Amino acid sequence: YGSWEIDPKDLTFLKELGFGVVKYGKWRGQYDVAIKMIKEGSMSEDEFIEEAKVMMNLSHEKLVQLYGVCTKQRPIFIITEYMANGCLLNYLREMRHRFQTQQLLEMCKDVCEAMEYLESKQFLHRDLAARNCLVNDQGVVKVSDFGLSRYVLDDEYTSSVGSKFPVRWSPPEVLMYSKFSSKSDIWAFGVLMWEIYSLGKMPYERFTNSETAEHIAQGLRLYRPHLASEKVYTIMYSCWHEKADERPTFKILLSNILDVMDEE
Numbered sequence: 001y002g003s004w005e006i007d008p009k010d011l012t013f014l015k016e017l018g019f020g021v022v023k024y025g026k027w028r029g030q031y032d033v034a035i036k037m038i039k040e041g042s043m044s045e046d047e048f049i050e051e052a053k054v055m056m057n058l059s060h061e062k063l064v065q066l067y068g069v070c071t072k073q074r075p076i077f078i079i080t081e082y083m084a085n086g087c088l089l090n091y092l093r094e095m096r097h098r099f100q101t102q103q104l105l106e107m108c109k110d111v112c113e114a115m116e117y118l119e120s121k122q123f124l125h126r127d128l129a130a131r132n133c134l135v136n137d138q139g140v141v142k143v144s145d146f147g148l149s150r151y152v153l154d155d156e157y158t159s160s161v162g163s164k165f166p167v168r169w170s171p172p173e174v175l176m177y178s179k180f181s182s183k184s185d186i187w188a189f190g191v192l193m194w195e196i197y198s199l200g201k202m203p204y205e206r207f208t209n210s211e212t213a214e215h216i217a218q219g220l221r222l223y224r225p226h227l228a229s230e231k232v233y234t235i236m237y238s239c240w241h242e243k244a245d246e247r248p249t250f251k252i253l254l255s256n257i258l259d260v261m262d263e264e
């Protein structure tokens with residue numbers, strides 16, 4: 001076993017949590033883990049395994065921690081930090097939480113910290129969205145599935161023509177030219193802020209993907225969620241400059257979010 005490789009015999013599977021299936025379990029009988037099981041034919045496995053070595057060296061409190069992989073048998077496993085409150089999107093949609101806006105801004109800050117870290121490592125997420133963030137037992141949001149889209153074999157998800165592509169989280173230059181950059185992550189982050197302040201509404205709710213792409217190409221934008229103050233709206237909106245070079249960095253976004261927290 002290499003440093004990136006976990007012995008699957010050290011795993012105990014306890015419950016199904018919901019590419020494939022994800023389970024909750026224990027490592028060596030004691031420590032909580034999530035086990036993401038990768039279905040046959042779904043992934044470029046050799047490429048993922050090499051990238052896993054890079055992903056192992058990423059470490060930040062607001063990034064879901066990759067403990068290792070199991071790849072000597074199939075389906076291959078991705079072993080990670082267990083996030084008790086599950087997917088951010090589902091969490092947002094649970095109206096019982098009765099969120100204060102302070103809580104929503106903190107979720108934004110959690111994600112922005114992770115993204116500033118990824119940016120500092122020149123690591124693109126490539127599919128940032130509420131559905132790809134997780135929430136722990138303390139209500140902390142962490143970024144997940146970072147870079148994983150690179151290894152998906154289903155073409156419907158691979159390009160902007162595809163029926164599974166994240167059109168609603170994509171800047172004009174991605175939709176038109178497939179130009180990915182730090183600034184396409186920035187765009188996606190703004191959409192994620194919008195999802196958070198909208199309590200999990202689908203971006204461009206009333207539009208198809210086709211219509212959304214048209215909307216975007218015409219320079220139209222999401223508008224202010226009811227729960228977003230003018231200051232918060234200014235921050236998400238800054239992520240959507242037509243010109244990619246005019247969009248902020250995650251460092252700048254983080255400073256702006258901190259400022260709003262201080263001003264309340």
Ligand SMILES: Nc1ncnc2c1c(-c1ccc(Oc3ccccc3)cc1)cn2C1CCCC1
Binds near residue numbers: 064080081085087145
């Ligand atoms: N870690 C998790 N803890 C709790 N629930 C989880 C996960 C994960 C999870 C586990 C592993 C995983 O693997 C990676 C993590 C980071 C980077 C790349 C892969 C991604 C998500 C998913 N789920 C749920 C959300 C909706 C239904 C399933």
